[PDB]
Amino acid sequence: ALYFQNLPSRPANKENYTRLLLKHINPNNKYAINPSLPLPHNKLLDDQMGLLEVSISRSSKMTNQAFLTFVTQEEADRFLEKYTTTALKVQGRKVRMGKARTNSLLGLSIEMQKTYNLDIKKVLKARKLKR
Amino acid sequence: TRYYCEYCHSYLTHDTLSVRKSHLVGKNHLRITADYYRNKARDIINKHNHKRRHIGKRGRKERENSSQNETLKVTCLSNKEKRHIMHVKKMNQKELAQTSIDTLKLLYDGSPGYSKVFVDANRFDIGDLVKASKLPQRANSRSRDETCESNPFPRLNNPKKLEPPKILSQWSNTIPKTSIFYSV
Amino acid sequence: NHMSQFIYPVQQQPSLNHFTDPNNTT
Amino acid sequence: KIQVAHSSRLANLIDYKLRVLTQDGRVYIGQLMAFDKHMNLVLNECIEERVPKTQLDKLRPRTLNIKVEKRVLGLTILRGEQILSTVVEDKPLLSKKERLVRDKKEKKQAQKQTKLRKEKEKKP
Amino acid sequence: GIPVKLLNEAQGHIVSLELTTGATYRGKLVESEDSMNVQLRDVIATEPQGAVTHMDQIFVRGSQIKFIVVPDLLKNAPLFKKNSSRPMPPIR
Amino acid sequence: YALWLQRIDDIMDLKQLSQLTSKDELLKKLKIDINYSGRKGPYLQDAKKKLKKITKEMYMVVQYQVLEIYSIFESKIYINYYTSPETLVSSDEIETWIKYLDYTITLQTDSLTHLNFQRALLPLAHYDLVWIKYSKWLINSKNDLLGAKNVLLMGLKFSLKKTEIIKLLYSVICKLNEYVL
RNA sequence: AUACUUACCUUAAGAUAUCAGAGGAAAGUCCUACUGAUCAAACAUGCGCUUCCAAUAGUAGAAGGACGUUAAGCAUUUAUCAUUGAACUAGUUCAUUGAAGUCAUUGAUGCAAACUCCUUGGUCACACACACGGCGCGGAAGGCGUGUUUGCUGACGUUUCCAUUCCCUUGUUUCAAUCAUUGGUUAAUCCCUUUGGGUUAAACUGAUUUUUGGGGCCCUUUGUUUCUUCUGCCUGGAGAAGUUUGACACCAAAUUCAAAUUGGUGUUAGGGGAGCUGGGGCCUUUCAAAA
Ligand SMILES: [Zn+2]
Secondary structure (H helix, E strand, C coil), rough: CCCCCCCCCCCCHHHHHHHHHHHHCCCCCCCCCCCCCCCCCCCCCCCCCCCEEEEECCCCCCCCCCCCEEEEHHHHHHHHHHHHCCCCCHHHHCCCCCCCCCCHHHHHHHHCCHHHHHHHHHHHHHHHHCC | CCCECCCCCCCCECCHHHHHHHHHCCCHHHHHHHHHEEEEEEHHCCCCCCCCCCCCCCCEEEHHHHHHHCCCCCCCHHHHHHHHHHHHHHHHHHHHCCCCHHHHHHCCCCCCEEEEEEEECCCCHHHHHHHHHHCCCCCCCCCCCCCCCCCCCCHHHHCCHHHHHHHHCHHHCCCEEEEECCCC | CCCEECCCCEECCCCCCCCCCCCCCC | CCCCCCCCCCCCCCCEEEEECCCCCCCEEEEEEECCCCCCEEEEEEEEEEHHHHCCCCCCCCCCCCCCCCEEEEEEEEECEEEEEEEEEECCCCHHHHHHHHHHHHHHHHHHHHHHHHHHCCCC | CHHHHHHHCCCEEEEEEECCCEEEEEEEEEECCCCCCEEEEEEEEEECCCCCCEEEEECCHHEEEEEEEEEEHHHHCHHHCCCCCCCCCCCC | CCCHHHHHHHCCCHHHHHHCCCCHHHHHHCHHHCCCCCCHHHHHHHHHHHHHHHHHHHHHHHHHHHHHHHHHHHCCCCCCCCCCCCCCCCHHHHHHHHHHHHHHHHHHCCCHHHHHHHHCCCCCCCCHHHHHHHHHHHHCCCCCHHHHHHHHHHHHHHHCCCCHHHHHHHHHHHHHCCCCC
16 A cells, blocks of 8 residues: 555556556566566455555546555555655656555455455445546 | 660660660760769758757756856848858868868879879779770870889979968968068 | 868068078078 | 558558568568569668577577677668568658658659640740 | 669669678679679679688679669669659650 | 868757767866756857867967978978989988977977888988987987887898998997897 | 761560349350449548657656777687608607688677667646546557448540639737727616617626737747748847749859859748538438338
C-alpha cells in the first residue's frame, strides 16, 4: 500500500506502463525480458524485494498518480526508506510518494486469509457513486 | 523497344549499343547532363534544413534567472544589403572550392625527376589513363627523357622569386605597416 | 565576382638608414 | 516496433528502410528505392552487417550480445541472385499524407513542364 | 529495369564491386552491359583474404557480381522520379 | 583561416560552439553560455562576433610570423631541391640558409628545428657546412653528444671535403669516451 | 532553331478480373455503360477497435547512432618457403643463392566500463486531483466494417462538350479603457384598442468592430516569418506591388564587354471565414410492404 504522484501518463497500455515503471524501480529485475506478465486475481508477486501488484486507471481524476502495493506494511515502508527521501526519477520526472490513505485491496486478501462483504459494499457504494 | 534519355528528354528509337553509346558520349547530351547534376548538386547546399522546433514551457526558475539578464540587441540588414552579402559569401565559397594550393609543384620545377612525377601525363599510375582520357578532338609538352644535364645552374637570371604569402581581404589592415629592411 | 578573397600583402619601406640596410657590413 | 500493411508488396513499399538477407549470411540495411523483375534492388544509405566466425558460437543454443562487424556503403545495387529474404526495419521520413502532397505537386509540375516545352517548340 | 539503368548512369565514375568469390574490385567503370557484366579501368583489387594488388584493366562476369557501390550523388538522378512527363514518341 | 571563419559562420546553434572549445572556457574567458535559455538568436550573433575577434588576434600573431619568415629568409631561397653532387649553390643562398637556421634555432622548436636542418640539408648536402653546424647545435644547445656523433657519421657520406667533419668527429668520439671506435 | 555533309541504327507476340445465367450475330466464337455472385483498385466513412506520440513542480529523460575518446585499456595468440656450405644433437644456430611477400604487432581476437558528442519526438490541453483498473483535441502506424465509383493507370488530340466563386490574415494570446453596430430584460412618459400592442429617451446583459494601454508566451524567422519582388526592422512584429498559357530565384557557358542571349534546376506557401458541393450519424413529418 503506497501512493505516488506526477508519473508519466503517456504509455496507454497497463502492461507496458507497468513494464516502464517496474523498469525504473529495479533494473535487471525479473521482467526486462517481456514474454509475459503475471495477473493475480482479487482474493504470487510481481518482483522481488517487496513488490506485488500495480494499479493504474485512465480516469481524468487519477491521471498521473499510480499506486503500488507490497507484500507487507514493513516492506512497503522499507521501500520508502530504501531511497530515504532521496527522490528517484521515472521516465522524465522525480516522483513524490507517500503512504496510501486507503489500505491495499490485495493486502486485504492476505490479511483476512491470516471477503464477500467488501465486494458487496463496493458494488453498492459504486452504484451510489454513479448517482 | 525505344531508349528514352531523360536528361535530354529526347527519345532515341530502337536502342542499340552503338547508337546509345554514341548518344551518351555526344557533346550535347554531355552538356545537358553535366548541367543537370550541377543543379541537383547545388540544391543540397541551397536547400535550408528547416528542422522542426519543439518549444517547452519555460520554468519559473529560469524565467527569473533570465529576466535579470539584460536583453541583447539584434542586427538585421536591409533586403538590398543582404542580397549583395549573400552573393559575396557564395562567391567566396566557390573560391575556397577551387583553391587547391600547388606550391610544391612550383618549388621542384627544376628537380632532376620533375618530369617523371609532376607532369602527370608521363607517370606510371596515372600516365596511361590520360591518353584514353584525351578528347576525340574531332576537327579544327615536357617529355620524360629530360636529364639534369639541361639547366645545370638553376639560377642564371631564370627564376622568379617565390610568390608572397596571401592575406585575408577583411583583415588586410592587420599587417604590420612597415617592413624591417629596405627592399629594392 | 569583383573583389577577391585573398590579396598579396603590400608594406611600407623603412626610410633606409644604416640599421635597416640589409647589405650593411661595417 | 513497426507494423507493415497486412497486404503490402515490394512495389507498395518504397523509401522504407529495409533489411536484406543474402545467401552468404550478411545483411544490407537501408532505404529501398527501385527493384526489378528478378528482384535486384537499389538501397540508398546501406550498411552491411556481418556476424564474425568468432561470435557465431555465441548464437548456438544453450541475454546474448553479439558483436556484429558492419561497414557502410552508400547507394548500392544488389543482385537478385544473392538475395534471400527481405524484412522491414523502419518507415519513411514522410507520412502517407505528406507523400500524397508531394506526389500531387510533382505531377502538376511535370504537366507544367510538358506545356512549357510544347509551346516553346511550337511557335519558334 | 531501373537498377541496371543506374549502373549505365555510373559510367566514367569510381565504383566498387563485390564478387561472389569474396574479392573487392574498386576502380573506375568503363563499360557495362544489360547482363551486368562490367569492365573497369585502373582498379585496386582486394583478394578474399585481404591481399591487395593493382591492375590497369579488368572485365568481370555479371553473374559473379554481388553488390556494386555507385557514387552517392546518383541518388537524386532522374531515374527515380515517380511521376514524370514524357513527350510523344516519334513515329517510325 | 577562411575555412575556420566559414565554419564559424555556419554554426546555427549554441550546442555547436562546444565543438570549438569546452563549456568552461567559453563561460570564463569569453563569458558566453551554451545552456543559456531565452531568445537565443541575437545572443548567438553576439557569440559569433566574440569568437571572431580572438580568431582575428590569432590571425594577427601568425600573420606577423609568416610575413617575417617570408620577408627575410624564404623569399631569398630560390632552390628547395637536391640537384646533384656536381651542383654549386650561390653564396647569398648559403648565407640565407645559415641565418635561417640560426633563427630556427632561436625559436627553440625542436621538431621545426630538425626539420629546417633536414630542409636545409638536401639543397646543399655536399659541402660539410650545414653538417658541422647541425652537429654543433645538437652538441651544445640540446647537449646531446651521441646525436652529434651520428650527425657527423651521416655527414661523412654526403660531404665531399670530409676533413673538418672527420676532425670534429675525432673530437666528439674522444669526449664520448669510445676509444675502440 | 533552320539548311547541307558523314556515321550509327530500325516493330518478341498476346492480353487488361473471374464465374454463372438470359439475349443477338447442334458446334464453337464475339458481343450486350444486360442480370446475379465473387475478386481487385480508388475514394469516402465509421467504429467506447490496437499500439505510439519527452522534464520544466525541472538542469532531466526515451529511441537510435559515433565510419568518437579513454586507448600502446585488460586478457590472449601471431610474423615467410626452397637449395648449398660450416658447427651441432642423432632436430638447432650462422652465411650465401632463388621464389612469392595487403598494410598493420600502438596490430588482430576476446572482455567490459566510463565519458563525450550527433539525429529524432504534440517537449499539445486540462489538471496536482486516494483508485479497482477510461470514455479531452489532435498526429503517426495498423486491423476490421459499411457505402459509392471504376474494372490497370496516365499523358496527348477532338466536341452544340460541361466547366465558371470570393473575403480576411502571415507574431500569437489575454485583460482593461473608450467608440461604433445588433439582440434580450426592467422603470418612466405619450398614443390606440385592469390587460395587450407600437414608439421615445434611460438603465442592465451578451455578441461583433475601431483606437490606446497593460500583461503573457515566441521571434533559430539564424538571408528576423521562408509565397515572391522592392522598401525596411530589436527603443520592433511594418509598408508597397504581384500570383500559373505568368512571374521569381539560381546554375552553365562563349562572346560581347555589366543588360540580354541560349540551355537547365527549383519556388509559386500556410491559416481562418462566407458561398457551392460530396459523405456520415441523429431528430421530426409524409408515403409503400410485412406482421
Ligand atoms: Zn541524351
